[PDB]
Design a protein around this nucleic acid. Sequence first.
DNA 1: ATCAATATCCACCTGCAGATACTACCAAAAGTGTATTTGGAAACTGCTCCATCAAAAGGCATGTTCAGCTGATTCAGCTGAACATGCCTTTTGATGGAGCAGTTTCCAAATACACTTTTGGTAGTATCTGCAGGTGGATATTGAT
DNA 2: ATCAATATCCACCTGCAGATACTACCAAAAGTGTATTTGGAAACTGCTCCATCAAAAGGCATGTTCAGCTGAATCAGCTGAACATGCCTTTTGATGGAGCAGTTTCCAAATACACTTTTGGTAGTATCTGCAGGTGGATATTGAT
Lengths: 95, 95, 98, 98, 106, 106, 82, 87
Amino acid sequence: RSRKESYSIYVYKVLKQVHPDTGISSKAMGIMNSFVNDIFERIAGEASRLAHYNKRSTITSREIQTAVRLLLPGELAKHAVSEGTKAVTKYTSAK
Amino acid sequence: RSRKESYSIYVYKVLKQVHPDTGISSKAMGIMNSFVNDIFERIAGEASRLAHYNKRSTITSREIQTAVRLLLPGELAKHAVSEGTKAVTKYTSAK
Amino acid sequence: PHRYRPGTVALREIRRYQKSTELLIRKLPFQRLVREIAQDFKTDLRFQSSAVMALQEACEAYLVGLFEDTNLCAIHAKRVTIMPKDIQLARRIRGERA
Amino acid sequence: PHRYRPGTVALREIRRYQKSTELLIRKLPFQRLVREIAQDFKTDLRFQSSAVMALQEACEAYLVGLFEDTNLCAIHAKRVTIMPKDIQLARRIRGERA
Amino acid sequence: AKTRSSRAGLQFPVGRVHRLLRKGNYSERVGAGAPVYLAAVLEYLTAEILELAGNAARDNKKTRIIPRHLQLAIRNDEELNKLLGRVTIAQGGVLPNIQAVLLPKK
Amino acid sequence: AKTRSSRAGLQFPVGRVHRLLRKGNYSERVGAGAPVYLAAVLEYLTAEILELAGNAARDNKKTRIIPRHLQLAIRNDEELNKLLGRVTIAQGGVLPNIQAVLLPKK
Amino acid sequence: VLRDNIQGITKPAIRRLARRGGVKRISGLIYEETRGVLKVFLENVIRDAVTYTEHAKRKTVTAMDVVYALKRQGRTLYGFGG
Amino acid sequence: KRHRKVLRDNIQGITKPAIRRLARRGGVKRISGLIYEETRGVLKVFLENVIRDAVTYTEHAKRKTVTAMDVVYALKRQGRTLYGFGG
DNA sequence: ATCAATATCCACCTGCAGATACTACCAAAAGTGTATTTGGAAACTGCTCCATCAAAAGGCATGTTCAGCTGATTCAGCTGAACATGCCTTTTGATGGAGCAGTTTCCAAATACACTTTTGGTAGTATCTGCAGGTGGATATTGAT
DNA sequence: ATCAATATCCACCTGCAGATACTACCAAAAGTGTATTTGGAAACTGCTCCATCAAAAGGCATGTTCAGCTGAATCAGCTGAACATGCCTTTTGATGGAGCAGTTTCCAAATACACTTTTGGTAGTATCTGCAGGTGGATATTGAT
Ligand SMILES: O=C(O)c1ccc(P(c2ccccc2)c2ccccc2)cc1
Ligand SMILES: [Au+]
Ligand SMILES: [Mg+2]
Ligand SMILES: [Mg+2]
Ligand SMILES: [Mg+2]
Ligand SMILES: [Mg+2]
């Protein structure tokens, strides 16, 4: 009965933007969920350590950004950083 | 001048118990300090994860115990679990 | 009758099994082995179907990976035939033992 | 005029260095190399001297460990001489370049 | 009432990411930008994989992404392969790859 | 006023371990037994290491434990060696070990 | 015709695994070596899985128990939850 | 005011004898002449990776000084945990 | 080379296992209004970190010499690849019930808060003691003969 | 075997860095004692989904045959060890200067928290279809001659 959350709604929405005529199997979707949760945990984990090392009680976008740089290879990091900074800009410039 | 705490005091007490006539260099003490901090984080981290996995918000001696069985190999686990069970049983019966 | 030369079917199987993703160990014997090993740690255990499958996916992907490194160790020694010493060297360097 | 045969002094050196714990790379050159590499990432950095020593202890322990694995790769090939291909195989199996 | 995702221009759920940061014991406090940034990062990486996996489906005359396609996408891209170097994709198989010295001579 | 270390039978500091568990963001709550059990495990392990290192000191005709003695103790014990298999002990060196084929003669 | 459970991992199945690993030729001693290695892997992962089971006060090993075990053994598996 | 002298080619300070010594500690009896450049290259990669992470922690903390702690945390991230320098 | 055997590729077809679509709640995001909390912005320290200069040794660079290791070559014998099929183990699908999971309850045990007490980490001086590094000088080890 | 060169061992012996010893010590913990809140064990049980098993399925155990791989043996070339010789660069230990980690005190901004709306997201349910296998026939690959 109880709710079992996942990212699949959102993975599917991003799939449609990227390949509008392409679908995805259930198994493939499980893998994509595992992927999001894994990277979530690695980034959050590094951000947590970063805050703790600097005796801060708060994880900000600056900890998320440094974590991304520590965790992602080169080109992926650059784009992830630019996508993250863009989303925070759009979010702020929005009454 | 701020207080930089360490486990030195306690490492030394334990040294005197096992080898009454043996000293320890400050570099050896540095290592022993890194070792305790390291094992603390590993046990605490396994305990944290384990509680989250079971939707608990409390880390009890039961979470520590399991984390110790996950982290330590064979005999060290067995002996560690005995000393910890016995420290709690004693602690509980001493108030 | 007609007879393929030694190695010709071996190559063919390499191409065939690298194209596909089906599990390559039969399910029941795997499941028995899992339960046997599990019995030494706790008796009267049941297993979700997906629990055993996750285990079989993990062992097979591990063993395939190990066979790749094993093969590199055989080739390093100017052979094309994998041996126990190749598996042992691969495990040693990986840090799985010794 | 007296000569040890090839291998005799090499074995003596293995016993000598395996017995001792001192850093084997000269300090000032190692420090220059750290400063050069860091400078290429970021200008105007300073280093605590213990930071540089921590890097040198890490780099030496990594290299010693790599040479053990490399040596096993040579011996597996029925040689006693380590070659670049032994280091590369060790690094590949370790997953440093897998 | 507007969602924080829609404000940030994102498909990934900012609110959920925020909650998952609170209740994961990562820190005592969470800044307002952090879930936005994190959600955008996860969306980005999701798009990148779905892009290359889609392409792999296309190459194999298929319109539905399966684990095989995810495996092909990940292991043929140098950066994704590194990010996911200690990860097993169930039902992924491996890349076709035969060592040269094993190919028949004549 | 008795310390919780004295109540529990312990040289290692229970209060300190409780506090480090709180400030580390491991969980919302910390049970009363948890730091007692953890301080004991920590004490056990350090006793184990110091026993063996003390022995390596004595074997090398020394009274003061240095990092080399800690390394010999760790690397000569199968279990401590596995527990610490991805750790470097500064100024530790290595175990004496020469592969057999490298020795002279036959 | 009784038979060990380990031996149910058969020469041809080990051979298929090798083939997916790109192996052309296989010594006869590999089959027993491989069985030993597989047993160790299963022991190490099942141990941790069951330890999670026992901690949750369950009698059924879940996919999640296996997934968490694999993760801490440095063998992260995607597609079965978590 | 002062500057800094240009740092170039410092990898060559990891000399042939220093590399022999490290190999000896690692149990090596005989060493091909190509090993020295190959080792310099492996060393450079390993240093770049650790320094990159350590400098990232420095910059995050808004310091100009790389601490032992920054190096220790960079080594830990890299799966090369080091005892003896804090933490 | 030619030529047969068999593997491999491609077009087309089609039923249904497994997608995508739709509906309808409702937990959990968002909105609102206070109630804490924090991370600096300025404004000072005392560090260490950098720089540099001089002396000295300890290790490094180089060239020579040839020991013995590597890699090529050849080859014989052993050892794994290929092979046809019915026996038998696994796969498939149908059916009780174990136990996971939903739900509710309630108190032993947790956090919170304001005192009181004690310990651990400093820093100032003082003393001590283990052992690093130097000294012969008695005991191996190696390699030429 | 025996002999001579030289590395190794070991044990005693003085300078001293690093260790242990107080002293005093205070600021931050840690402890003690109510007041207050609640997480999760306990108990009951609904309903997945798990173990078992009968009939249907199709992979593997087997023994023979010999292709071709591995490992042994031989050896010519040349690479890499050993060592002598000349001296550059590192090590060591000063000294000064300052760039900058590390604190502390005030707030303006930011984030938590208790309370209410107002959905977006899930489970359950209902349609829709991509493609796994199947066949049929052309073509490539392999191996024999
Ligand atoms: O990182 C790898 O994946 C890797 C694979 C193989 C080798 P081996 C090697 C030896 C024979 C055939 C094929 C490969 C090697 C490398 C350089 C020169 C000579 C031999 C080295 C590295
Ligand atoms: Au190789
Ligand atoms: Mg004792
Ligand atoms: Mg001495
Ligand atoms: Mg030749
Ligand atoms: Mg088809």
